[PDB]
Amino acid sequence: KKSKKMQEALKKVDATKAYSVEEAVALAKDTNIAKFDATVEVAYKLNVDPKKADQQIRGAVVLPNGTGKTQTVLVFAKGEKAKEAEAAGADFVGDDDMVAKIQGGWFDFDVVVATPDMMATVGKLGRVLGPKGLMPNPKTGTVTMDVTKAVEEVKAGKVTYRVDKAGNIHVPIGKVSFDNEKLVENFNTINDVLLKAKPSTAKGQYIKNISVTTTFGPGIHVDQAS
Amino acid sequence: MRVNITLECTSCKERNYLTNKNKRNNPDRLEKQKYCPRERKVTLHRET
């Protein structure tokens, strides 16, 4: 069912033990034996079922230490505001008509933003950015008058989150090479934003499970009260 | 079947009037323009 490396990694993990965040992250630094700088994932099994409209959860958080990987920012801007995006460090900024170039080109880029009324034009390309997840959603903070802040935050390592219809939310908190202190700080930031994002109509226990996992290692259950 | 009814004010919902109707001759809810003492104005009143 598993290779010896995963079997060996399994021996270092207790299936029935809920680890503290301090222990789990440090253990993750030993269960990331994959032959590359694997990412570290956190999965919360919220009790909310997104089938109900008021139960849906979506947004983004500016991770304090970032994920350690650059994000390519595409900015739809009007007037001199476009130069503001370039000054803020936008990877590439497009006019109203550059959507045609994006259509069939300039793919393999990470995020899109509107400033903010450009959405009247971005709607045409929404069917392309939509299913790919690139559609600028105000709930995620990709649409705003403060494009100068939006651009620089993304370069700082803003990571989006979205509960799937099954009732899970996954987010990359950083690379396995990160110091546990920095890694813990990112993990805690994710915890706070989710609690702040708890829907007002939630009932019962909110976080039914937290699991830490590497790109290749096993999941590690952790205590939300720790 | 003659029955007693109340005519509510369609504006403020005050049950302002006691009257009666024959349900056979007036199946639908009786509607009248009656003075509402709350709003101090003539308003449409409907049986509730």
Binding site: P50, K52, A53, Q56, P116, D117, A120, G123, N137, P138 | -
Partner: protein
Amino acid sequence: MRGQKMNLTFGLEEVYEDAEFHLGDFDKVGIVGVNGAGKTTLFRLLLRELKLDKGKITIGNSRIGYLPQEIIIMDEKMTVLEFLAEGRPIKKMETELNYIYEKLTVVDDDKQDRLLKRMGWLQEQLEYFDCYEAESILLDLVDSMQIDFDLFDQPISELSGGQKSKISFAKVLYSKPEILLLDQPTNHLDSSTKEFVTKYLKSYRGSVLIISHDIDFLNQIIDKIMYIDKVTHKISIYEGDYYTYKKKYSENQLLREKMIIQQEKEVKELATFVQKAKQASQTNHALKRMGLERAIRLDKKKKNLTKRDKVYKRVKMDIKPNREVARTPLKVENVTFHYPGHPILYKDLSFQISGKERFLVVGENGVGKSTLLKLLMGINIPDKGKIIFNDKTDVAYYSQELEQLDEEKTILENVKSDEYTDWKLRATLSNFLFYDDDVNKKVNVLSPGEKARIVLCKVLLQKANLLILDQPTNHLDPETQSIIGANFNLFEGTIIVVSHNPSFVEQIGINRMLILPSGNIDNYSPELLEYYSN
């Protein structure tokens, strides 16, 4: 789904009186009741279209898929694809979302907060109803009921009754609902199409309430049966199938009848003694004393004596022709017809009816059955050929979709005829269960079943010798169907009938069947099944 102390009274005729019902989740409930019992009204309460005069009706927050008893065609020019697409709110939200973008450009810093929230919800809502459905619907038609794509671009109003029922059923499924409220989902379907619907409803994991007058169809699906009583204005919920409901119900009414019998005997006994004392000599003091004492018991008895519910009256039909049939009522010779822009339905169609004959126009959905009957009456002019009616033949037409009633006028106004006086009209409407001021009701507020009786009454009042009936038993409660079939059997005239109900055709006793689209004038027999198979 739960309802408490339900009350609802349209004018003077009441529907529910202190009615109650509790439906557990994941219950395939079969709703049964005579025409007018209030089965459709229950769904309107669930859909919040209606409000109870008194009481509380409780519904779960889950999304509900509703299949109306009547097709909702907002505009005549609506296409089938437009009709189906309206099942999902994708188009509606996009039109709203497109306007939101317009407002964002116009408004700079005033309404942005409100607009941004509205935009976000629409995107999240749109993704929840994944916009990939455009492709799924196209193939949902194929896998559902073999609905051809040529219909997909055709106006919905031009479809046949059976075809429309397929589209409406598919639309409900297209919406991806959580609770299924099906109001006669197989009203016009043929035998083959009914098979698919049954299998899907058997497999459907969720809760599904079915209003149906088809006992066999329900028995295969129903696990709980809800009976809407027309006389007690109440709701009773049984566990089991239609037969179990009939068995439990028949026993309960039997046990109730016996109770009222014994209470009457005791009242008669006291009454008989009270009278004996009443007529005794005034000099018999003790008997007079005992007579008054029993008069007190007699009074208390008569005040606790349960009233037997008046058994709901069944329809009485006496259809007789004014004149006599000929040996050749109808002559059809070399008749060809095609709807402009569509393939020819039949070529050189030629048949000849014999008189006092049961003529069945067999076929499948969308094969030309209703077109042929419309052809005879004169609604459709034949592209080729001739249709000749003998001067001795009077014709009465029962259309499939109930297109012979004025929704704006009342029941009495619809049946008004130059040949019938007022009391004559009322007497027949009472035979069709329209009593007293029930005939002044607008046709627009009647149920499909009650409207079918008015159409039948129009056919009866003609006293024609040829009956062109297009699915007569549709919308009728099972009891009224058997009455319809039995009375037609005794009709002393020619009957051209179309019916997908196997029971109804057996009662009429068909003589010759005309198969479509392959024109085959054949003697009626269980070989009808052979044609259905082939």
